[PDB]
Design a binder for this molecule. Structure first.
Ligand code: KU7
Ligand code: MN
Ligand code: MN
Length: 178
């Protein structure tokens, strides 16, 4: 049963992001052919994590998301044993070598206030940065890590994705599936 959102995801995002999203869903036991809105969300958040990592200097960010669960936990062990930072209870998405903290990036369909609460509820010392499909962002202690142009590029891409879905009538189903 091939959905329209599955075919849109493969045309909307780059193949390396699509393949990483598939492996991430097959691990943890999910099907991109069925949980197709979730398939889109993983690709979206993966692309945001990659753009974020490209916003700083060359050696600034270590990327944790998009890895196998074991090697992602391997890299944070090495980070924490090199930096002397607390090992996070849950896997974060990035590490900032310049500001010496982990980052949990969020991409949300609701308003940025509510998700940060939920994200901070499950969190203690790692930095938190939320993006929305409506252009809003919220970061821990109002420190948005990157400069304005890099974040604005991420917001523009998010709104383009929402437009492309709406143009095919997939947005309403994607908005109310979170
Ligand atoms: O890394 C994360 N989870 C570890 C892998 O879990 C998986 C579970 C099922 C399938 C694939 C992976 C992590 N999870 C989450 C959220 C809220 C907490 C649990 N959750 C998920 O299950 C959904 O995943 C995401 C939701 C939106 C954007 C990116 C995501 F990935 N949001 C994040 O931003 C995030 O980075
Ligand atoms: Mn993650
Ligand atoms: Mn995240």
């Amino acid at each position: 049963r091939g959905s329209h959102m599955e075919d849109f995801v493969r045309q909307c995002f780059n193949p390396m992001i699509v393949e990483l999203a598939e492996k991430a869903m097959k691990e943890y036991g999910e099907d991109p052919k069925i949980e197709t809105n979730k398939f889109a969300a993983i690709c979206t958040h993966l692309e945001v994590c990659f753009m974020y990592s490209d916003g700083g200097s060359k050696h600034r960010f270590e990327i944790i998301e998009g890895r196998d669960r074991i090697m992602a936990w391997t890299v944070v062990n090495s980070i924490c044993n090199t930096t002397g930072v607390e090992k996070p209870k849950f896997l974060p998405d990035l590490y900032d070598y310049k500001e010496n903290r982990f980052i949990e990036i969020g991409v949300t369909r609701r308003e940025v206030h509510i998700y940060y609460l939920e994200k901070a509820n499950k969190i203690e010392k790692t930095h938190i940065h939320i993006f929305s499909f409506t252009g809003e962002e919220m970061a821990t202690k109002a420190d948005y890590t990157l400069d304005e142009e890099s974040r604005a590029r991420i917001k523009t891409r998010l709104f383009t994705i929402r437009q492309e879905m709406a143009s095919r009538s997939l947005w309403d189903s994607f908005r109310q599936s979170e």
